DNA sequence: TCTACCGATAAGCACAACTACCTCTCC
RNA sequence: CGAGAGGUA
DNA sequence: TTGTGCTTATCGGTAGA
């Protein structure tokens, strides 16, 4: 009873003069499956 | 509804009435050009009633009636008392003329009053 | 101007018959009259005056109604208060005002506050040109009495209130001059039913 | 049916039938104000361009509603005698 | 006409009128078949049937209130109005 | 209500001349339908003639085949549209006094001659020595949509007039119910939001032909107005052949007496109420 | 970029009132024949031509003269000089949100950002316009929405791109407001927050509310659905299903019944009886799905043999027909038959992707 | 092949039923178990494809 | 000479769009 | 306890 | 998405003293 879903990661780089947002679920035999 | 462009500005045309030449003259506001018309005409349009545009097939507006018919006069050529009438000139006659045309799909016999 | 001519003729026929119908002793020389008739002795202009007449009732001579027709149109107070006038120097209590258009709010008011004093009746030109009565829908009315009001009361046992009710503004009602609290007999092509005017 | 034959002539029959009322509607569908020339008992030299144009009938009926009601109480009324034609195809034990 | 315009003076709007020689024993065409489905879809008992409950309950609100009396007379449960003085009865042994 | 329907029956008088019925009904027709002018005139040009004191003047060429089926003449139409904008003269707000139309069988134009057997039909303005109406944008928009509305034949209040045949009329005859056939006429008229009830003016229309109309049974097609024109009555009268008609075409047998009752519930206090709420609380009150 | 034909009730008189052709563009209600002679337009004569109606009708003509009168009228001297574009700049500049760009920005990347050229975009605002009319004069049918020629679908490419994309919004409003909270009085793992956007998606997969492409706000429902076991075409049937989002589903209206562009593409022989009756409609066994193209087609187009549009607006096409590209002008070709027949023959030589529509109709001649 | 768009002929399944010792028409004559005696009418049968549904009696005892 | 009610027409707002049941699935 | 979707007569 | 009412309200719109 939970949930099948996939981490995103994506690099965020702060400038002044890859971190978890968020998961989506994932159908079945998608591109990413097992 | 006739529109014309000046041979020199390529805009535009504006009729209008001289008093002192009493003759008609097409003038554009951009340029002072004033030159001369042809057949006097400055509106021509072809009278259409077709004011109800994709409009008239989803209402029945009844552009073309239906005949009427009567059950009282009776035909010749088969006993059927259904008939259309309507009143049409003839040829050469002068005048309305009645005529009856026979409703039966079998018989197809048209007389006149 | 003949058209005039003989929608007048049409309203004086038809306002004839219906005083024939509510009993004002109508004579047939003024029923069975034809257009020539009527154009003849006319004459060459009436102005709408010669129509003014004065009727009384068959039974009863002291109960009497004056018809009257207006000068012109779009009456306004005055001719109201000339009327009125009138009809008290006259000793008249009941008026027909044969109208060409509708009246002023004011008239209204007017005729609604001597109402107690005498009843009055308006009828356009346009509603007295085909006799309401004479149609093969409308059925017969025949109006009762006192006496035939009481005995349909005490014979079913019901009180006026709880009647069928027709109101004043009916076409029926205005033709035969019918005032609030007076029932009707109607009889259909047999049973019979009665409505009270409200 | 009772054979392969009857088959074929009931086929036949439905088939002229049916044109048959195809053709009396278009006859019915002619019962307008705009006709009322040809109608008449004249002499019209457009009588062949009457029957040459059977494709835009369908075309003039769809696109109306009086029409298409009268077009129907034609189609009706011609497809009465095609429906009266199971008694005498059809035999006494047929169950329907 | 089933493409959209006949031809072109265009078209906004048809009344669909077709007639199906074949029947259901020889089989039909597909484009019978989607002719046949077009005319019968219209029918369908769910699709239009709140206006006879709706007409149903409002006549019924109207008229259930009327009753017959021991006097002969068809009264009113509002008041003892009066409704009809007789009722019809073509067949009066009731 | 806006559609209006109305019923009127032919007179009995009709039947003593061969095809009395059908030539009566054809006239009333004839008479008593509406026929704007912009049916019937084809070619509409305004020409820049130039006391007449007149800059612009407008062109209907008409072709004598419409005014022959229509049977209708020039002189016809000419004092037509001069009636017309001599009774309402309300619209055009302009510095206009009058207004004279011409008649020419032949006019001298020179633009197209396309049509040789087209009449003309001249429509001059008349200015009272002024330059308010030498606009040519004024009077396109003005005065030439408002004479094409103006009909020729009939009056506005007539929308269409159609004859029918019945079998079982609402309003039957007097006693010769031997006929079993009619062929009264159906007229539509536009709902008159106004005072003014539309079979009053109806009436009007009809005074040149009120004896070939057979006023003892034509009765308007509504219910609720047909109660305050002829009474109560004949409006339950209507109401119970409707309802009649109604259940036969619903394809169920209901007695006569259900039906009765339920025309005399729904006009107990004089007046057909409505089956909603408000009707109920009217009733009431 | 909306144009329409309507009465002028701006500066009208009594006696004037009459139809005239208005531009909707960024909420400024502006004229056409200024939007006209704004896009590098210094002639009548030359719009005319560009809006090649190719018929004689009386209130067309009479419509282009009364927008030509009110364009005149609104604007002093429109034709010379830049006067145009103050007055567009202005009539911009006076919305309630105007954007940060000048006239001649707000121009290229917000007006027909398809064309790079400025004359280009006036011809196909001469198009439109010549298309409208033809529309208004009945030579060419109107869009309805029965059709699926007029329709597209999307299954999950565009349905959880919009729901992504306003989670990450929110998402990054509240971090920029922790940020703003946190900066005046840090690693970047903690200001973005990693929860909000997870719970949105349960939230939309339970609830079944999901974001409406039009608003905001009133989350249509229907649109995720469970799953039946009962037998396997249950569930065959229930993942290949199109849903039509009609309000009020009580008077579906027109699109409850089976249309002809329905062959072969959806099943007009079995549709859910009741309500919803025709707004659900079954794919058919021989379906699929088009998905967006990665290659661009323009050199291969080019290479057939269609050239460029011309850049010029003074002159005008002869009998070269118009070729549109996903609804963008991206040439001529001269005679369409044999320019079709090559793209076929090219994509038939898996030249050219397979997923694409050719179309050549004789009535608009493009 | 039962091909919906691809039916075969009437007279092709008379003709294969013919062919497997039976009635072209589908009927056989049967007779009544009953009584023993045999029926004068002709009762058509055939193996048809039935499904049974989710919905039972015990389901809508309330 | 200057209103006092009366009338026609947008306009914006409401209530209403059938019964008796059985299911799942978030709260 | 309600709410949302499907189904039965 | 319409179907009826229901109340403002909004301009004239007539007499009218
Ligand atoms: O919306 C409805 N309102 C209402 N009062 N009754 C109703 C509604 N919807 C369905 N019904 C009831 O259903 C039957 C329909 O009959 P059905 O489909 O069960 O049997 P048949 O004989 O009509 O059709 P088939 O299956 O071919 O044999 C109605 O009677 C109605 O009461
Ligand atoms: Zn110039
Ligand atoms: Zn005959
Ligand atoms: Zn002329």
Not at chain 3, 105 to 124: D, M, Y
Not at chain 5, 50 to 63: A, E, K, N, Q, V
Not at chain 7, 279 to 288: A, D, E, I, Q, T
């Amino acid at each position: 009873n939970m949930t099948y879903s996939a981490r995103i990661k994506v690099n965020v780089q702060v400038e002044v003069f890859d971190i978890l947002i968020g998961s989506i679920p994932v159908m079945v035999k998608s591109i990413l499956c097992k | 509804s006739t529109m014309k462009f000046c041979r020199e500005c390529n805009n535009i045309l504006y009729p209008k009435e001289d008093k002192e030449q009493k003759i008609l003259l097409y003038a554009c506001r951009n340029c002072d050009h004033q030159e001369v018309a042809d057949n006097s005409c400055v509106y021509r349009n072809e009278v259409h009633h077709s004011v109800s545009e994709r409009t008239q097939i989803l209402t029945d507006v009844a552009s073309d009636p239906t005949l009427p018919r009567t059950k009282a006069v009776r035909c010749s050529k088969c006993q059927h008392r259904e008939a259309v009438f309507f009143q049409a000139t003839a040829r050469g006659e002068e005048g309305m003329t009645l005529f009856f045309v026979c409703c039966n799909p079998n018989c197809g016999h048209r007389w006149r009053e | 101007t003949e058209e005039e001519l003989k929608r007048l003729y049409r309203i004086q026929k038809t306002l004839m018959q219906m005083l024939r119908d509510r009993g004002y002793f109508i004579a047939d020389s003024e029923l069975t009259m034809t257009k020539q008739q009527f154009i003849r002795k006319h004459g060459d202009n009436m102005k709408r005056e010669d129509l003014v007449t004065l009727k009384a009732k068959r039974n009863d001579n002291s109960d009497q109604l004056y018809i009257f027709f207006p000068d012109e149109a779009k009456v306004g107070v005055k001719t109201m208060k000339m009327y009125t006038n009138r009809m008290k120097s006259e000793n008249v209590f009941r008026a027909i005002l044969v109208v060409q258009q509708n009246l002023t709010p004011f008239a209204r008011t007017c005729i609604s506050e001597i109402s107690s004093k005498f009843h009055l009746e308006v009828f356009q030109e346009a509603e007295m040109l085909v006799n309401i009565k004479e149609h093969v829908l409308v059925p017969e009315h025949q109006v009762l009495t006192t006496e035939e009001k009481k005995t349909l009361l005490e014979r079913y046992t019901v009180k006026e209130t709880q009647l069928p009710r027709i109101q004043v503004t009916d076409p029926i009602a205005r033709y035969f001059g019918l005032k609030r609290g007076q029932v009707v007999k109607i009889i259909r092509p047999r049973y019979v039913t009665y409505r009270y005017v409200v | 049916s009772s054979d392969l034959q009857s088959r074929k002539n009931l086929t036949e029959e439905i088939s002229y039938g049916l044109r048959e009322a195809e053709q009396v509607c278009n006859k019915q569908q002619l019962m307008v104000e705009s006709w009322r020339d040809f109608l008449a008992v004249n002499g019209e030299d457009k009588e062949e361009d009457s029957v040459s144009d059977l494709a835009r009938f369908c075309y003039e009926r769809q696109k109306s509603a009086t029409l298409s009601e009268l077009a129907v109480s034609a189609f009706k009324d011609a497809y009465r005698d095609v429906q009266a034609l199971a008694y005498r195809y059809g035999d006494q034990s047929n169950s329907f | 006409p089933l493409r959209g315009a006949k031809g072109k003076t265009t078209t906004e709007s048809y009344v669909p009128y077709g007639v199906i020689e074949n029947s259901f024993l020889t089989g039909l065409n597909p484009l019978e078949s989607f002719v046949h489905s077009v005319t019968s879809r219209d029918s369908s008992f769910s699709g239009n049937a709140d206006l006879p409950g709706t007409l149903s309950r409002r006549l019924m609100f109207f008229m259930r209130d009327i009753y017959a009396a021991y006097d002969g007379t068809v009264r009113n449960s509002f008041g003892n109005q009066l409704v009809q003085f007789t009722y019809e009865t073509d067949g009066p042994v009731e | 209500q806006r559609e209006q329907t109305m019923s009127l029956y032919l007179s009995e008088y009709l039947s003593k001349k061969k095809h009395g019925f059908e030539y009566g009904s054809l006239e009333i027709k004839n008479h008593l339908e509406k026929l704007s002018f912009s049916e019937i005139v084809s070619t509409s040009m305004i020409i820049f003639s130039p006391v007449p004191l007149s800059p612009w003047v407008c062109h209907f060429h008409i072709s004598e085949k419409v005014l022959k089926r229509k049977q209708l003449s020039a002189e016809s139409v000419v004092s037509s549209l001069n009636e017309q904008y001599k009774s309402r003269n309300r619209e055009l707000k302009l510095d206009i006094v009058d207004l004279d139309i011409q008649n020419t069988n032949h006019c001298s134009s020179d633009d197209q001659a396309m049509k040789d057997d087209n009449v003309c039909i001249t429509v001059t303005v008349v200015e009272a020595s002024k330059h308010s109406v030498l606009e040519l944008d004024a009077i396109r928009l003005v005065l030439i949509p408002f004479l094409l509305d103006s009909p020729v034949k009939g009056d506005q209040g007539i929308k269409k007039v159609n004859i029918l045949w019945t079998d079982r009329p609402k309003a039957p005859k007097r006693n010769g119910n031997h006929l079993a056939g009619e062929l009264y006429l159906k007229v539509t008229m536009y709902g008159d939001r106004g005072k003014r009830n539309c079979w009053t003016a109806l009436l009007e229309t009809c005074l040149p032909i009120m004896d070939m109309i057979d006023w003892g049974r034509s009765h308007p097609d509504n219910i609720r107005q047909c109660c305050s024109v002829y009474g109560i009555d004949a409006g339950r009268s209507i109401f119970v052949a409707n309802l009649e008609s109604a259940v036969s075409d619903t394809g169920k047998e209901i007695l006569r007496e259900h039906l009765l009752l339920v025309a005399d519930s729904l006009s107990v206090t004089g007046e057909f109420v409505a089956l909603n709420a408000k009707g109920w609380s009217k009733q009431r009150q | 970029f909306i144009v329409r034909l309507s009465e002028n009730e701006k500066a009208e008189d009594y006696k004037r009132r009459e139809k005239v052709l208005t531009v909707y563009f960024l909420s400024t209600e502006i004229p056409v024949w200024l939007l006209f002679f704004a896009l590098g337009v210094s002639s009548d004569k030359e719009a005319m031509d560009l809006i090649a109606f190719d018929g004689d009708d009386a209130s067309i003509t009479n419509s282009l003269i009364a927008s030509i009168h009110v364009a005149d009228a609104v604007c002093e001297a429109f034709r010379c000089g830049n006067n145009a574009l103050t007055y567009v700049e202005q009539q911009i500049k006076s919305t309630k949100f105007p954007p940060a760009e000048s006239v001649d920005e707000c121009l290229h990347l917000y007006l027909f950002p398809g064309l790079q050229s400025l004359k280009k975009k006036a011809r196909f605002l001469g198009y439109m316009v010549k298309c409208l009319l033809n529309s208004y004069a009945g030579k060419r049918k109107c869009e309805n929405r029965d059709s699926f020629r007029n329709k597209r679908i999307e299954l999950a490419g565009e349905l959880l791109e919009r729901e992504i994309r306003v989670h990450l919004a929110h998402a990054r409003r509240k971090m920029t407001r922790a940020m703003q909270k946190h900066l005046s009085g840090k690693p970047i793992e903690h200001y973005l927050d990693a929860s909000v956007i997870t719970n949105g998606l349960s939230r939309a997969f339970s609830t079944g509310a999901w974001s409406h492409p039009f608003r905001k706000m009133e989350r249509v429902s229907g649109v995720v659905a469970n799953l039946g076991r009962a037998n396997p075409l249950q569930t065959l049937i229930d993942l290949r299903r199109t849903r039509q989002q009609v309000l009020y589903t009580g008077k579906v209206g027109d699109a409850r019944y089976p249309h002809p562009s329905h062959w072969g593409r959806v099943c007009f022989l079995s549709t859910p009886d009741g309500e919803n009756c025709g707004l659900v409609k079954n794919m058919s066994l021989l379906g699929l799905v088009s998905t967006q193209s990665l290659e661009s087609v323009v050199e291969k187009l080019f290479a057939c043999g269609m050239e460029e549009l011309m850049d010029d607006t003074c002159t005008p096409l002869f009998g070269k027909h118009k070729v549109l590209l996903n609804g963008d002008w991206v040439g001529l070709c001269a005679d369409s038959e044999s320019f079709v027949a090559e793209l076929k023959s090219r994509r038939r030589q898996s030249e050219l992707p397979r997923e694409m529509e050719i179309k050549r109709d004789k009535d608009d001649n493009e | 092949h039962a091909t919906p768009f691809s039916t075969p002929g009437v007279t092709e399944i008379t003709e294969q039923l013919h062919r497997a010792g039976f009635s072209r028409w589908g009927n056989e004559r049967v007779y009544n178990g009953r009584s023993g005696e045999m029926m004068r009418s002709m009762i058509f049968m055939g193996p048809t494809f039935y499904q049974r549904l989710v919905h039972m009696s015990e389901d809508k005892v309330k």
